[PDB]
Amino acid sequence: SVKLAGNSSLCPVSGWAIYSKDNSVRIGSKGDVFVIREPFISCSPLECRTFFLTQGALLNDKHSNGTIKDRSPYRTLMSCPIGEVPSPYNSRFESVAWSASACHDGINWLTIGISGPDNGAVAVLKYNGIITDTIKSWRNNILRTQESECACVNGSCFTVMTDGPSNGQASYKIFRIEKGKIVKSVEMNAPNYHYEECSCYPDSSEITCVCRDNWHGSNRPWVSFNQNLEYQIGYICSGIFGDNPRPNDKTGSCGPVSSNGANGVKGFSFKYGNGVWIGRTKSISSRNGFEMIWDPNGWTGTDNNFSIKQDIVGINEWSGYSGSFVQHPELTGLDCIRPCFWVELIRGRPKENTIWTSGSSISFCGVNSDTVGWSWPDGAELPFTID
Amino acid sequence: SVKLAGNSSLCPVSGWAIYSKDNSVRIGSKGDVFVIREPFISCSPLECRTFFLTQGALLNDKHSNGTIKDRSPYRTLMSCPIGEVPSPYNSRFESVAWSASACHDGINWLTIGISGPDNGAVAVLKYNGIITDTIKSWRNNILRTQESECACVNGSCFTVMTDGPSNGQASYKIFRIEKGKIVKSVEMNAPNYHYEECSCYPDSSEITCVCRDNWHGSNRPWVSFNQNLEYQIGYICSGIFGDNPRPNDKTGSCGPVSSNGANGVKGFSFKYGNGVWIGRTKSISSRNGFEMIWDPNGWTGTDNNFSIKQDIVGINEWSGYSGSFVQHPELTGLDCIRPCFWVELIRGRPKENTIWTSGSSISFCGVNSDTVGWSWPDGAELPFTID
Amino acid sequence: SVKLAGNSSLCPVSGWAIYSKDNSVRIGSKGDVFVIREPFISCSPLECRTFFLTQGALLNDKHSNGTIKDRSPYRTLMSCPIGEVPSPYNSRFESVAWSASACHDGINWLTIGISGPDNGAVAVLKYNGIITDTIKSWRNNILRTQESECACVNGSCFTVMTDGPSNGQASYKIFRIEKGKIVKSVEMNAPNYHYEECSCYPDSSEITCVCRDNWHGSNRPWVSFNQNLEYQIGYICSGIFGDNPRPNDKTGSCGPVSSNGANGVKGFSFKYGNGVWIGRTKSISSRNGFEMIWDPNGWTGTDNNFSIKQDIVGINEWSGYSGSFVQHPELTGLDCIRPCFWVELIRGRPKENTIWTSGSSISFCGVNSDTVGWSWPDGAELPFTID
Amino acid sequence: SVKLAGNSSLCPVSGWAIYSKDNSVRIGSKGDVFVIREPFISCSPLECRTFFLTQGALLNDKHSNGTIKDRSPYRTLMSCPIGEVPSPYNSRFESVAWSASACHDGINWLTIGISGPDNGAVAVLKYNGIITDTIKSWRNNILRTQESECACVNGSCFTVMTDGPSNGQASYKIFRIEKGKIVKSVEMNAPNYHYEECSCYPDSSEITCVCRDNWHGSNRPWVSFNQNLEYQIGYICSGIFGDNPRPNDKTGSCGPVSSNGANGVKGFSFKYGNGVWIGRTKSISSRNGFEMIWDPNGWTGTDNNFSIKQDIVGINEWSGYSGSFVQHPELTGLDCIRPCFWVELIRGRPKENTIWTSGSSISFCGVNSDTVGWSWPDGAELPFTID
Ligand SMILES: *[C@@H]1O[C@H](CO)[C@@H](O[C@@H]2O[C@H](CO)[C@@H](O[C@@H]3O[C@H](CO)[C@@H](O)[C@H](O[C@H]4O[C@H](CO)[C@@H](O)[C@H](O)[C@@H]4O)[C@@H]3O)[C@H](O)[C@H]2NC(C)=O)[C@H](O)[C@H]1NC(C)=O
Ligand SMILES: *[C@@H]1O[C@H](CO)[C@@H](O[C@@H]2O[C@H](CO)[C@@H](O[C@@H]3O[C@H](CO)[C@@H](O)[C@H](O[C@H]4O[C@H](CO)[C@@H](O)[C@H](O)[C@@H]4O)[C@@H]3O)[C@H](O)[C@H]2NC(C)=O)[C@H](O)[C@H]1NC(C)=O
Ligand SMILES: *[C@@H]1O[C@H](CO)[C@@H](O)[C@H](O)[C@H]1NC(C)=O
Ligand SMILES: *[C@@H]1O[C@H](CO)[C@@H](O)[C@H](O)[C@H]1NC(C)=O
Ligand SMILES: *[C@@H]1O[C@H](CO)[C@@H](O)[C@H](O)[C@H]1NC(C)=O
Ligand SMILES: *[C@@H]1O[C@H](CO)[C@@H](O)[C@H](O)[C@H]1NC(C)=O
Ligand SMILES: *[C@@H]1O[C@H](CO)[C@@H](O)[C@H](O)[C@H]1NC(C)=O
Ligand SMILES: *[C@@H]1O[C@H](CO)[C@@H](O)[C@H](O)[C@H]1NC(C)=O
Ligand SMILES: [Ca+2]
Ligand SMILES: [Ca+2]
Ligand SMILES: [Ca+2]
Ligand SMILES: [Ca+2]
Ligand SMILES: [Ca+2]
Ligand SMILES: [Ca+2]
Ligand SMILES: [Ca+2]
Ligand SMILES: [Ca+2]
Ligand SMILES: [Ca+2]
């Protein structure tokens, strides 16, 4: 086994080829499939896995009742091979968690699972499934992390955590982790910024994270840093606003866009110089639809012009969280780090008249060969028999 | 790991010994078994797997409703060990796909999965589960491929794809693929021919494909080619017509037989000089029954005489698609490439009064020791509880 | 990997320690468990597996209807780790079969599966899951084999097959098989003998089989042979009669005991010089109960005295088939071949008012440390919901 | 593979970080989950597994009826990866057993499973799944063992067994086992002591066991010994009484505390010099709640003062058995033996109006980084459909 180098650049890509679809909710109508939310994908040098937060219950069973609820002692982080439904019969147990991150350094899996009370939550770090560290809430207000993969470079893995209000100034910390041990952390000096649920990826030995401002930004905040945790911060400038909810596209800002800025959804974007690939919902007001947009000056420019749009999920279909994942040269044999992404397709409450909330997933990888837009939605027929 | 040589000749065989039976539909009456169609078998140097197109739903569940439908965003290519039922608990995810092929070059699996809209479908190629190439519809009319294994020789794998009408002249291309990458393709110059759903196998370093003419042939078209994609084309001459539907046996043609020529079913045949092993339905009008026929001059001769017939499925039982698969010397230790075949046993719509359509499978391998004809049908009792 | 030597003697044992219990029928009341019968155990140098003939259906489903029937095209030989329930989710597919045998030579698994019509059945032999030979019915009257493990010595494996009447003189052949290929066979010259369902084990480089006389013997016939298939035949002499049905114990015979001799059950015994360990039902008239009896002169002596009796299943509980299996020094590290045995616990028809018939299993291994008699019965409560 | 050394000291710890939660009962409402009780965790150098005694039945099925019953021929010891629900689809079969222990010596698993009649039970010992020894009841009164992991040092593993009354003086033996073979045993000379269900761990080459006195002690008895089985005995002195039931905390005793001393629950404690980490229920009268208490002089001192309390399960929630497990340096890379523990969360009879009794589990590992108390209860809603 060898550490992932993480020193090559992100592969430029012209479109997105479909990689996986699990059909979890459709299958769970009969099969034994976990009620889940907050899924994400992460790869080792050998395989790619879907991680997810269970609700300690199965679809179409009474224990799925009330699963709109975000945090409980029953939620667990588990994983299964990409594209398979999350079932008790094919899933690896990772951690007890209502917020999580995970990533592979080339040698072993790092998992981070946060559980405990809202006023004193504890992140448990594991390396190869053995507890290696913990970090406890420092603001006593829902310690929370990425809900997507952490990022690794040369044996060090990096993540971001938040503690404090979701509707005002909070506290954001970056962590450097080696063999599951926190070896350095820094608090970001980001007055007037808000960071939640960062999607972080490696690119030329440094980490870029695109996150969710739940306080007052309808564009997405970003933070980038080197292995020594020297960081920079900003917001994506494009008038192609990335959050949900958001206003109709118009002139943007390199600071937080206040219009429709409260609340949000976990998302991601890939930076290429001044340009950016933005993944976003199609609806400006609800978690519906998904599309990928290439905006060649969208990282630093405020106009609402863009060059490419690719459909992923139709506007009349449910979407949800989305996040980046990468495939390193050690896995692919390429000379660059390949960008991929996943989308959570949320079914049930609050929009649908069920007793439960759960998601399925789709994923795509970037390529420079021909691609096509379409809609690959969840496809389940609600309500279910338990409803 | 070593590349399959693919340079020995096809083993001559006198009969077919039963190899597998999954009983998928019988078992799915209670168990958690995927609704599937278009199954096929393919082997590595170590094992044989059943590939199949799911409908993203389980048998005896409401989401099986309407599964007579051929293409949707929910269909996925998955695989499991040969003879096992396709379940979410034992199946490997391969690709999102409503048309597919797969084969192992001795090192890794190649999978090809076509998804997207009818007017712009995209084939996603994976090698060891990593996306390696794509090819997009060139006629904007249901890009489609084998629904059986591709064929590999010395590290190159080969397949055929079609784009265009199913009731008139279409476009047919041959592809050479190395480590999941298309390295060469050619369009077949086949005016008045129609090719779909080719069953292709290697034989002495060259590829032979026997396919389905849905336009105007009740005999089967074939195409054979070397590693440089220099090809020859024709139709099986035998008056023992191979397609379904078809006329009663009589004098055949080395061109497309127009009588009952429209429509068809995926099938296969094995060429041995002027002779041919033909697998076909027993019914001339419907997908019922299956038999293997040895016709010693049937490749090139038009008479309706034959030498051996072996029963596989009784005429009063449902059959469906069939296809070739081979076992290379690297797997068997033999000094020739062994021919095997599978049969899809289709249950449900349109012939039966159910809300769903799904198949089970049987397979056989060629031998020169004693064999026997019989009927190994699906055996499920319809309708099901859900109907 | 190395061939099993098979040259050490059978370990003498004073009692039987319980090794496994699967509770298949109890579990199948809810879980997805195959309807099975004719289970048996066989070991490699690394693990022990339960083989079984499915009925291509699950317990408590309508397709379990009529499963008292012995032969059909739906029956398949499959296997799972010892002690686990036979489910579609944990079972390896082996062969299509309504009669079977299997054994590991130290390198790979040999499986033998007989399918086809009663008047022309074909045994398909596989080595490492690849078809290596076939043998076809020579009397056109239900070709049939052990329903327990074959026996291996120095890279050669041995089995017995029968063809002909079950109520009169039939034909019995011994086979020597190497890497799945029949390299020698001989027909036993056994006028007035009847052999079915042999339980064969290796002992000092030679094979001993104890079988079922369905024609006219309530004691068990035996055949022993060396690697060159030079054989001897006889019947177990003990007045402790081994078959079911049978008379009450009395003076026995070294030939077939005619009293209650018609019909029978698959069983086994272990020879130790003049002595014998006999496994048998407790009831003389029905497949109820099970016990192990040590009779120190029972192989060659006709008296009805014995020295040890150990209870296995109570007389008021259902039993069924039983068979030997061994654990070689290559697996155990012992300096002798260890005798073990399994018992099939049959539930359903004809004795119970259900639509189905299925079995669970228990197994035991011989030891010289302390043991105890008890009853470890099936434990399912019939009828089931489907009945 | 290398033997565990077992020669380093127990890691001192300040708190307990949550390690696993299986949600078995919640999931078994729909999924195929074993009815179980007496679960425990044990690790190899590579992984940690949950062992458990099934009732040979699944949750929400009629065969779960009467499972309050402790011993039957249907109970089996099985195991699955830690944190996964115990299902027939993910569980390894270990032994037929209604009382058990297991542990890994660094090379292979030792399992001990006791079955048979109350008046003559037999413990079957397996090493790598092969029977290696047996030991039979010596007092003919429910031979019984730990229901948690045995302890290994330098290739020798150690356990404790009891035979005799649960309401008066019984007999207690210590065993030294090498490669599954009993190489030494001694009977403890413990008049007026009572030992059941010992929780034993290694610490500096010696074994410490903390057990259950069901006769007349509401504090816990202990026994410690070296590899030669030279032992010492006593009771935990702390006025923080460890058993359930028990009196309210007050001045304790270094002998058995008679007040509320009859009956009990399996538990554990970790000795650190004069100090002790005590895990106990929160209720003094019933199996409800769980907490960890650090009492710096509680091993040898009788006062009821303590320094740290950490909540694990709320007082209004069901708990049950608890036990120690360790993680050796060979697994963790640490320079000490890490203490962890599990808690069984018992649902059903006798406290709840169901036909069945079953448990789920949680586990924690000791650390010196920040931790938090909370309640991680079972969470199932009773009764179930079957009730
Ligand atoms: C699989 O699919 C088939 C086909 O969809 C499905 O059978 C259909 O069931 C639906 C719903 O029960 C039926 O739809 C009804 O049709 C009647 C006329 O026959 C209408 O009167 C009904 O409409 C009234 O009620 C609606 C709901 O309250 C109102 O919205 C509407 O305005 C009317 O007031 C309704 O449309 C339909 O008849 C059948 N179709 C067929 C061909 O049988 C089947 O149930 C599905 N199977 C499973 C397992 O899901
Ligand atoms: C799990 O076990 C419990 C306890 O066994 C079980 O509840 C029991 O159900 C049985 C069967 O329904 C009940 O037995 C009946 O009791 C009544 C008196 O209350 C008797 O009159 C009945 O006997 C008559 O009918 C029998 C059958 O026809 C005749 O054989 C008999 O001679 C009489 O004519 C019968 O015994 C019993 O009352 C309950 N017991 C309790 C405590 O509730 C439960 O059903 C089981 N659960 C599952 C899921 O299997
Ligand atoms: C990336 O890291 C690898 C592995 O250490 C190193 O060999 C290589 O020089 C680096 N690549 C570049 C482009 O600097
Ligand atoms: C969901 O939970 C609520 C709160 O306990 C309860 O009232 C209701 O019965 C539950 N609904 C279902 C369908 O179980
Ligand atoms: C087939 O290929 C193998 C492997 O390269 C080669 O050694 C051999 O010469 C070829 N066999 C024949 C018969 O040409
Ligand atoms: C058994 O076979 C082994 C392996 O070949 C051989 O070494 C040994 O001599 C034989 N044992 C006896 C007792 O003859
Ligand atoms: C069993 O099969 C018979 C014969 O077809 C049929 O009449 C009956 O309905 C079946 N019984 C059940 C319970 O399915
Ligand atoms: C513990 O055992 C190891 C392995 O044998 C040995 O090397 C070492 O000396 C021991 N450690 C201590 C602290 O005694
Ligand atoms: Ca926002
Ligand atoms: Ca722009
Ligand atoms: Ca045609
Ligand atoms: Ca001819
Ligand atoms: Ca007989
Ligand atoms: Ca005698
Ligand atoms: Ca089910
Ligand atoms: Ca007590
Ligand atoms: Ca104290």
Author numbering:
A (entry chain B), B (entry chain A), C (entry chain B), D (entry chain A): 82 to 169, 169A, 170 to 306, 308 to 333, 335 to 336, 339 to 392, 394 to 412, 412A, ...
The paper states:
NA, which is a sialidase, catalyzes hydrolysis of terminally linked sialic acid and functions as the receptor-destroying element of influenza A and B viruses. Additionally, influenza A NA is further classified into two groups: group 1 (N1, N4, N5 and N8) and group 2 (N2, N3, N6, N7 and N9), based upon primary sequence. Group 1 NAs contain a 150-cavity (formed by amino acids 147–151 of the 150-loop) in their active site, whereas group 2 NAs lack this cavity. NA inhibition assays were carried out and complex crystal structures were solved for laninamivir, laninamivir octanoate, zanamivir and oseltamivir in order to elucidate the structural basis of their inhibition.
Surprisingly, the p09N1-laninamivir octanoate complex shows a completely different binding mode: p09N1 adopts a Glu276-Arg224 salt bridge in its laninamivir octanoate complex, forming a hydrophobic pocket that is also necessary to accommodate oseltamivir. The rotation of p09N1 Glu276 places it out of range for hydrogen bonding with the 8-OH and 9-ester-O of laninamivir octanoate. Instead, the p09N1-laninamivir octanoate 9-ester-O forms a unique hydrogen bond with Asn294. Additionally, 09N1 Ser247 forms another hydrogen bond with the laninamivir octanoate 9-ester-O at 3.4–3.5 Å. Furthermore, in p09N1, the position 7-methoxy of laninamivir octanoate is also oriented slightly away from its N-acetyl group relative to laninamivir and there is additional electron density pointing toward the ring, indicating lower stability of the p09N1-laninamivir octanoate complex. In p09N1 molecule A, the distance between the 9-ester-O and Asn294 is 2.64 Å, however in molecule B the distance is much further at 3.93 Å. In a similar manner, the group 1 Tyr252 side chain promotes the native His274 to occupy a position where it can participate in a hydrogen bond network with Glu276 and Arg224 as observed in our 09N1-laninamivir octanoate structure.
